[PDB]
Design an enzyme around this catalytic site. Structure first.
Site, PDB file in Angstrom:
ATOM      1  N   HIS B 122       1.476  -0.451  -5.252  1.00 45.56           N
ATOM      2  CA  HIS B 122       1.127   0.779  -4.571  1.00 45.56           C
ATOM      3  C   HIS B 122       2.041   1.892  -5.087  1.00 45.56           C
ATOM      4  O   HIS B 122       3.181   1.637  -5.470  1.00 45.56           O
ATOM      5  CB  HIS B 122       1.314   0.500  -3.077  1.00 45.56           C
ATOM      6  CG  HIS B 122       0.807   1.524  -2.127  1.00 45.56           C
ATOM      7  ND1 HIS B 122       1.395   2.765  -1.934  1.00 45.56           N
ATOM      8  CD2 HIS B 122      -0.237   1.439  -1.260  1.00 45.56           C
ATOM      9  CE1 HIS B 122       0.722   3.396  -0.980  1.00 45.56           C
ATOM     10  NE2 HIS B 122      -0.254   2.602  -0.546  1.00 45.56           N
ATOM     11  N   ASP B 199       8.067  -4.803  -1.056  1.00 43.32           N
ATOM     12  CA  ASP B 199       7.037  -4.043  -0.353  1.00 43.32           C
ATOM     13  C   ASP B 199       6.150  -4.985   0.464  1.00 43.32           C
ATOM     14  O   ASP B 199       5.228  -5.620  -0.082  1.00 43.32           O
ATOM     15  CB  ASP B 199       6.258  -3.172  -1.318  1.00 43.32           C
ATOM     16  CG  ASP B 199       5.114  -2.408  -0.667  1.00 43.32           C
ATOM     17  OD1 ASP B 199       4.878  -2.640   0.523  1.00 43.32           O
ATOM     18  OD2 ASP B 199       4.489  -1.568  -1.348  1.00 43.32           O
ATOM     19  N   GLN B 202       1.609  -4.910   3.382  1.00 42.74           N
ATOM     20  CA  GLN B 202       0.336  -5.605   3.500  1.00 42.74           C
ATOM     21  C   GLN B 202       0.543  -7.070   3.915  1.00 42.74           C
ATOM     22  O   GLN B 202      -0.387  -7.709   4.410  1.00 42.74           O
ATOM     23  CB  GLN B 202      -0.477  -5.372   2.223  1.00 42.74           C
ATOM     24  CG  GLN B 202      -1.831  -6.086   2.198  1.00 42.74           C
ATOM     25  CD  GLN B 202      -2.810  -5.697   3.297  1.00 42.74           C
ATOM     26  OE1 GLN B 202      -3.552  -6.537   3.829  1.00 42.74           O
ATOM     27  NE2 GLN B 202      -2.851  -4.415   3.629  1.00 42.74           N
ATOM     28  N   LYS B 225       0.054  -0.617  10.213  1.00 40.44           N
ATOM     29  CA  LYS B 225      -0.827  -1.633   9.622  1.00 40.44           C
ATOM     30  C   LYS B 225      -0.877  -2.910  10.475  1.00 40.44           C
ATOM     31  O   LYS B 225      -1.724  -3.780  10.236  1.00 40.44           O
ATOM     32  CB  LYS B 225      -0.369  -2.001   8.203  1.00 40.44           C
ATOM     33  CG  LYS B 225      -0.266  -0.870   7.182  1.00 40.44           C
ATOM     34  CD  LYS B 225      -1.249  -0.851   6.021  1.00 40.44           C
ATOM     35  CE  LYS B 225      -1.054  -2.014   5.076  1.00 40.44           C
ATOM     36  NZ  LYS B 225      -1.903  -2.194   3.867  1.00 40.44           N
ATOM     37  N   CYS B 362      -4.233   4.276  -3.760  1.00 46.70           N
ATOM     38  CA  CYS B 362      -2.826   4.487  -4.106  1.00 46.70           C
ATOM     39  C   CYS B 362      -2.322   3.495  -5.177  1.00 46.70           C
ATOM     40  O   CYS B 362      -1.124   3.137  -5.224  1.00 46.70           O
ATOM     41  CB  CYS B 362      -1.964   4.415  -2.838  1.00 46.70           C
ATOM     42  SG  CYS B 362      -2.407   5.693  -1.617  1.00 46.70           S
TER      43      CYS B 362
HETATM   44  C1  LIG Z   1       1.195  -2.712  -0.263  1.00 52.89           C
HETATM   45  C2  LIG Z   1       1.390  -1.418   0.380  1.00 52.89           C
HETATM   46  N1  LIG Z   1       2.510  -0.700   0.094  1.00 52.89           N
HETATM   47  C3  LIG Z   1       2.740   0.562   0.680  1.00 52.89           C
HETATM   48  C4  LIG Z   1       1.814   1.131   1.579  1.00 52.89           C
HETATM   49  C5  LIG Z   1       2.155   2.386   2.078  1.00 52.89           C
HETATM   50  O1  LIG Z   1       2.671   2.206   3.396  1.00 52.89           O
HETATM   51  P1  LIG Z   1       2.665   3.538   4.374  1.00 52.89           P
HETATM   52  O2  LIG Z   1       1.517   4.499   3.943  1.00 52.89           O
HETATM   53  O3  LIG Z   1       3.937   4.309   4.050  1.00 52.89           O
HETATM   54  O4  LIG Z   1       2.618   3.076   5.774  1.00 52.89           O
HETATM   55  C6  LIG Z   1       0.643   0.426   1.909  1.00 52.89           C
HETATM   56  C7  LIG Z   1      -0.384   0.902   2.740  1.00 52.89           C
HETATM   57  N2  LIG Z   1      -1.531   1.326   1.986  1.00 52.89           N
HETATM   58  C8  LIG Z   1      -2.799   1.893   2.575  1.00 52.89           C
HETATM   59  C9  LIG Z   1      -2.754   3.426   2.545  1.00 52.89           C
HETATM   60  O5  LIG Z   1      -2.358   3.962   1.502  1.00 52.89           O
HETATM   61  C10 LIG Z   1      -4.110   1.446   1.848  1.00 52.89           C
HETATM   62  O6  LIG Z   1      -3.980   0.410   1.178  1.00 52.89           O
HETATM   63  O7  LIG Z   1      -5.214   2.105   2.005  1.00 52.89           O
HETATM   64  C11 LIG Z   1       0.446  -0.828   1.263  1.00 52.89           C
HETATM   65  O8  LIG Z   1      -0.689  -1.512   1.597  1.00 52.89           O
END
Ligand SMILES: Cc1ncc(COP(=O)(O)O)c(/C=N/[C@@H](C=O)C(=O)O)c1O
Ligand SMILES: Cc1ncc(COP(=O)(O)O)c(/C=N/[C@@H](C=O)C(=O)O)c1O
Lengths: 407, 407
Positions: B122, B199, B202, B225, B362
């Protein structure tokens, strides 16, 4: 006029007892209570349209987005900013001030450069500048206070020089109750080619803010002090300054293109909003603004003027009590009982149902200046009454007698 | 076993229609929905014991404090940390990862030093490292992926060298659904004298986390999440590493002594918590943990295994559909219809009541690696059912026919 009975009816938290006495909550400068309209806004968000932001994906996702950006617009109108590009949602005043210290100060200070603050600043408006000056080899200065704890414009012209890059000052002091001459200070700052950074945590809840009229370069505020949720604040900045600052944090949402090694940023304000944002909190901050606006900030301000005048008068009727700061003031009184430690004052008051705060109030330098190691503080808001101030002064009287008898 | 009917009854948001169809919410990887237990926790906080933190002042202030620190303890137990000193409340995964980049990377990277990441990261787990390497003149490397989008330990031993200072990798990919071999990667990282940054945005919602067993140095997660409020996350770090890191932000709460120019910091974890904290959100995060724990993370994980297997099977029954990533996976499917833009898939699905996400998720580098410019994604959680997966696959079939007929 505002009806205090009708106002109080909207704050469930007020209607309870502590130690068998009706709660008398006089700690709104530490944090404010929330009306139904704000709590129910959070409930409705989570019950009905929670989703991540980004229009044009799915229906809940669109509603969440419109809620979040709609709250950005409510904030813009609330402080009279020109553009939503100037309205950044942060975790709070502290984070807002650190972003300016990080992205603005650290990129614009050379040895010989000055940052000027004051002796009455909260730590949020001290430590970031300490760190930034140390990182750049620049110099930190303090505008002195007058004897009543206000600031004179003359001292400002004296402290600020043509080497000053930043003036950072509180709008309203959370200790002294002083309302600082922000608008004149911004003119002085600009005359020397500085920017002015305004700590508005204690002003925003309690009085109308107009960033066009104040001509401040940056302004920071906290939701939790203004009937809004915890965990949310605002950084306002002149668009032309924000355009030139690099982001303080990096990740999703705040990017445009991401390559292996290099990335570009979104437009303002999103450039400064990394990761999933504070969706519910920002939406509740918008509700809090709708609530305060419907009552009228001017009405809230008048109410606090009456509460503060009443309090100063009733305090002066007590022997052995020192009150700190000027006669003209925001709605709070910091004080000490002769020969009673403020921690003890707080403790004993809580047994009477009365919530006040004792300590440094995050203003160690100011306590030093006052030549005390700690103080007690009663702080007011739109839901407080004169009856409650009577209970406070009556309780301080009994505290005096009680510790006179222990001795 | 967990009863999905009883679970669904706890999420008010699920019981509504969009465009005249029952809502089918399949976007939990973007954000999850909240049960009553979490929402009511927020209600009770604001209705009953909201106050700033600091024990021993007043009764509400004590309750708020015990609530906030109590939630810190719930998090510690939840991820099996040794100490509350290792549990820092932040705004979210993104901020958590940036703190490590700021306070850890920027203070420990010299030219010649490597930070190693992967192609599936991400942006939250990319841009902070881009910036930190650029600030220090160090070097950024990427561990390659296998053809099915998993990572081989051999590639890890290859990419990581004795110049590697940091390995940063996702526990579970929000695109591929891959569960990465974190525990083996930490052993490799340590063998070369690196730290590992995980990280866990997820992974944490969906499977048990055990930081002692994983032996990760840092681990980041997001409340939103995992059935918890927005605006709140956690940075876990080994105490000995946090002890040596300077704070990322400065102000009240995180100080011990404040002089005019110099200040000292509080002990962990408070050293990393500047300003009024995310009181209600953290308390609701604690509620969310109590909720997930009562159901059992293992039960939730088994449920998602069944949903993912069912989904992969039903997807393979569709012609003209590509699914990305491995067979063993978390509870999500990222995919594309041949000759249908994913944005259009999302749009048309929403008209059938079905919430999915389309875009880069992302993960721009990962999309490049997949040789696509965008994808669609259905993502699952504890409240989703196979019936809902049927509606999804039936809707994708109709989407294919409908765009075949437009053509
Ligand atoms: C593996 C992983 N790493 C970082 C994030 C970002 O977390 P936050 O947006 O800061 O709560 C996320 C959350 N991602 C969302 C939103 O960006 C999505 O997958 O749509 C993630 O899944
Ligand atoms: C003038 C002024 N500047 C900064 C702050 C800190 O704002 P946040 O704690 O980050 O929401 C505050 C809030 N101060 C509280 C808590 O520290 C108090 O006065 O008890 C303030 O009043």
């Amino acid at each position: 006029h505002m009806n205090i009975t009708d106002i109080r009816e909207q704050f469930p938290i007020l209607h309870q007892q502590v130690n068998g006495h009706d709660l008398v909550y006089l700690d709104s400068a530490a944090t404010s209570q929330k009306p139904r309209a704000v709590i129910e806004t959070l409930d409705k968000y989570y019950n009905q349209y929670n989703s991540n932001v980004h229009r044009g994906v799915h229906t809940l996702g669109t509603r969440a987005t419109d809620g979040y950006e709609g709250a950005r617009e409510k904030v813009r109108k609330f402080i009279n900013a020109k553009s939503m590009a100037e309205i950044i949602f942060t975790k709070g005043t502290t984070t807002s001030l650190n972003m300016v210290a990080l992205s603005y100060a650290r990129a614009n200070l050379k040895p010989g450069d000055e940052v000027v603050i004051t002796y009455m600043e909260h730590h949020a408006n001290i430590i970031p500048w300490q760190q930034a000056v140390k990182a750049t080899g620049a110099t930190l200065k303090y505008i002195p206070l007058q004897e009543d704890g206000t600031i004179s414009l003359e001292d400002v012209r004296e402290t600020v020089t043509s080497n000053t890059k930043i003036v950072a000052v509180s709008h309203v002091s959370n200790v002294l109750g002083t309302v600082n001459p922000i608008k004149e200070m911004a003119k002085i700052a600009h005359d020397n080619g500085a920017v002015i950074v305004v700590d508005g945590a204690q002003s925003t809840p309690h009085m109308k803010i107009d960033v066009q009229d104040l001509d401040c370069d940056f302004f920071a505020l906290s939701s939790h002090k203004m009937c809004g949720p915890t965990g949310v604040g605002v950084l306002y900045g002149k668009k032309a300054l924000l355009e030139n600052m690099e982001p303080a944090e990096f990740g999703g949402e705040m990017i445009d293109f991401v390559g292996l090694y290099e990335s570009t940023w979104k437009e303002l304000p999103w450039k400064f909003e990394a990761g999933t944002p504070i969706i519910a909190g920002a939406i509740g901050l918008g509700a809090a603004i709708d609530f305060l606006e419907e009552i009228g900030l001017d009405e809230i301000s008048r109410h606090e003027h009456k509460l503060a005048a009443y309090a100063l008068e009733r305090f002066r009727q007590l022997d052995g009590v020192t009150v700190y700061g000027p006669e003209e003031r925001a709605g709070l009184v910091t004080f000490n009982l002769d020969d009673v430690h403020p921690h003890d004052v707080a403790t004993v008051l809580d047994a009477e149902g009365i919530a006040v705060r004792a300590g440094h109030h995050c203003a160690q330098p100011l306590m030093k200046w006052l030549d005390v190691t700690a103080t007690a503080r009663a702080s007011f808001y739109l839901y407080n009454t004169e009856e409650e101030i009577d209970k406070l002064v009556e309780a301080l009287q009994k505290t005096k007698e009680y510790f006179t008898n222990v001795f």
